[PDB]
Amino acid sequence: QSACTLQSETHPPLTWQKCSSGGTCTQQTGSVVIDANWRWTHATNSSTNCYDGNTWSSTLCPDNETCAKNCCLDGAAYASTYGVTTSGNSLSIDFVTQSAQKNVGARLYLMASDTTYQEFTLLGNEFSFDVDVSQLPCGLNGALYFVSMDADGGVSKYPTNTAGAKYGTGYCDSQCPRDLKFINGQANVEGWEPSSNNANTGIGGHGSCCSEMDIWQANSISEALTPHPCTTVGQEICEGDGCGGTYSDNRYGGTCDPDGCDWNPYRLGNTSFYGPGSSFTLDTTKKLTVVTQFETSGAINRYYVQNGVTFQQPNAELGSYSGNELNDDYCTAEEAEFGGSSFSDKGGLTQFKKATSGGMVLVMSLWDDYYANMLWLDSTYPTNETSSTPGAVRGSCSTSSGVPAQVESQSPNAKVTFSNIKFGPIGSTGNPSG
Ligand SMILES: O[C@@H]1[C@@H](O)[C@H](O[C@@H]2CO[C@@H](O[C@@H]3CO[C@@H](O[C@@H]4CO[C@@H](O)[C@H](O)[C@H]4O)[C@H](O)[C@H]3O)[C@H](O)[C@H]2O)OC[C@H]1O
Ligand SMILES: *[C@@H]1O[C@H](CO)[C@@H](O)[C@H](O)[C@H]1NC(C)=O
Ligand SMILES: [Co+2]
Numbered sequence: 001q002s003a004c005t006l007q008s009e010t011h012p013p014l015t016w017q018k019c020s021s022g023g024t025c026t027q028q029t030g031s032v033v034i035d036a037n038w039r040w041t042h043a044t045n046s047s048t049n050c051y052d053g054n055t056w057s058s059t060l061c062p063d064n065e066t067c068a069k070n071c072c073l074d075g076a077a078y079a080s081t082y083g084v085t086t087s088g089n090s091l092s093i094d095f096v097t098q099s100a101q102k103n104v105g106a107r108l109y110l111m112a113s114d115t116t117y118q119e120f121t122l123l124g125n126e127f128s129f130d131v132d133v134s135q136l137p138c139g140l141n142g143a144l145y146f147v148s149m150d151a152d153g154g155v156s157k158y159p160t161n162t163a164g165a166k167y168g169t170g171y172c173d174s175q176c177p178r179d180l181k182f183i184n185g186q187a188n189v190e191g192w193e194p195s196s197n198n199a200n201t202g203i204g205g206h207g208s209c210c211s212e213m214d215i216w217q218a219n220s221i222s223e224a225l226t227p228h229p230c231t232t233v234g235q236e237i238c239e240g241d242g243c244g245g246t247y248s249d250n251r252y253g254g255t256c257d258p259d260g261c262d263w264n265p266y267r268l269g270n271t272s273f274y275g276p277g278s279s280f281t282l283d284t285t286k287k288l289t290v291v292t293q294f295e296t297s298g299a300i301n302r303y304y305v306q307n308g309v310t311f312q313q314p315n316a317e318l319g320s321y322s323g324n325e326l327n328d329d330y331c332t333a334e335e336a337e338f339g340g341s342s343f344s345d346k347g348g349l350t351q352f353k354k355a356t357s358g359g360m361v362l363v364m365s366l367w368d369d370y371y372a373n374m375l376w377l378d379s380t381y382p383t384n385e386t387s388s389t390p391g392a393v394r395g396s397c398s399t400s401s402g403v404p405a406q407v408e409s410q411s412p413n414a415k416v417t418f419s420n421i422k423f424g425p426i427g428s429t430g431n432p433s434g
């Protein structure tokens with residue numbers, strides 16, 4: 001796609017801290033950009049929609065190539081249309097925003113400059129952030145994570161994409177998503193099937209795969225830490241049901257692991273750790289600090305801080321695994337006790353280390369789940385299972401929760417706030433900010 005300028009593109013600014021082994025941190029000035037799927041897509045020469053509701057213009061977009069030539073992405077009114085605001089080191093994303101139309105959530109990338117994404121090399125380093133999840137009920141997900149995106153959002157590889165990172169192009173994740181309207185500088189119109197339950201979305205013949213590090217998938221009831229390996233580390237197109245993942249008929253068909261080696265303290269038996277009010281170890285009505293460390297073994301370690309008190313990832317016992325570090329033993333024992341071979345099939349933490357050793361883009365998103373109502377995160381999944389199936393219960397939310405239409409109508413003012421991002425060598429981020 002090209003880019004148009006009927007509405008101007010000003011990325012909301014956002015600062016964060018780069019910290020050093022020597023114990024100081026210094027401020028970095030970045031900004032955030034909304035993914036292309038949320039944008040208006042129209043004819044380069046007019047205001048005629050290339051994409052409308054959940055279908056494409058059959059004349060403008062008779063095929064992927066022609067569509068991409070005819071069509072541009074335009075600017076975003078971040079606050080008024082998308083409910084996205086920043087203030088210093090603080091980002092907020094509202095759930096439902098009402099302008100001329102209704103908007104649901106946002107997916108945002110951190111920018112290095114107006115035209116390029118910021119890449120972080122995770123291995124050997126740690127990432128710290130503050131989050132307020134108090135306004136996030138069952139069925140919602142305020143997500144902070146990393147994906148192996150190209151810093152330019154695909155421009156150098158596919159010159160028919162001239163919009164780039166500036167317009168939030170290039171997305172890929174471990175689901176090989178097929179809901180994307182542009183992949184590899186072409187439209188996804190060929191094979192498009194509009195969604196049965198979502199007025200604004202559909203599923204194309206192509207998807208976009210890549211490694212994904214889910215630092216934080218969470219609401220006020222449940223939270224999960226999840227690495228997802230792919231046989232191809234970086235962004236790569238996939239064809240139809242070969243994509244695998246959520247958007248395909250067959251989940252395990254493809255090149256990515258869409259399940260991941262997930263760590264959810266509730267799922268692992270400690271139901272007292274994380275939730276709303278004073279009866280939990282971490283009170284989700286208040287802001288909390290989340291620190292995630294990527295040791296060079298490829299294992300992942302985690303601690304939390306709330307009102308000056310530090311808590312490690314809680315100990316979990318699972319088969320012959322015991323401890324709080326997400327390592328090969330945990331992941332192998334998880335597959336053994338909970339089932340599945342997708343993580344080990346795609347190479348485990350070894351394959352995943354190849355992504356953390358390379359550059360990854362920071363994503364911050366707020367979403368509801370039109371596919372499984374977020375039950376896999378905060379409820380019992382599949383829903384026919386009981387507490388007697390190992391790993392079935394992942395939170396305290398009803399199996400009736402998170403119908404998108406319901407939660408959008410009842411909880412339009414839901415929102416997430418991420419703040420005080422700090423990145424550097426392991427051990428460094430608890431030092432005073434610059
Ligand atoms: O000036 C007018 C333009 O502002 C208007 O632009 C519309 C802005 O909203 C666009 O709809 C977006 C599409 O993305 C939805 O998010 C989905 C969430 O789930 C994800 O899996 C999926 O990938 C996302 O697409 C978002 O909620 C929704 O608001 C709409 O298409 C634009 O056209 O166009 C008319 C102009 O006059
Ligand atoms: C859950 O984890 C916290 C933090 O490690 C711990 O203090 C608490 O005792 C755990 N709860 C249970 C019921 O074991
Ligand atoms: Co193709």
Ligand SMILES: [Co+2]
Nearest residue numbers: 295297299325
């Ligand atoms: Co270790």
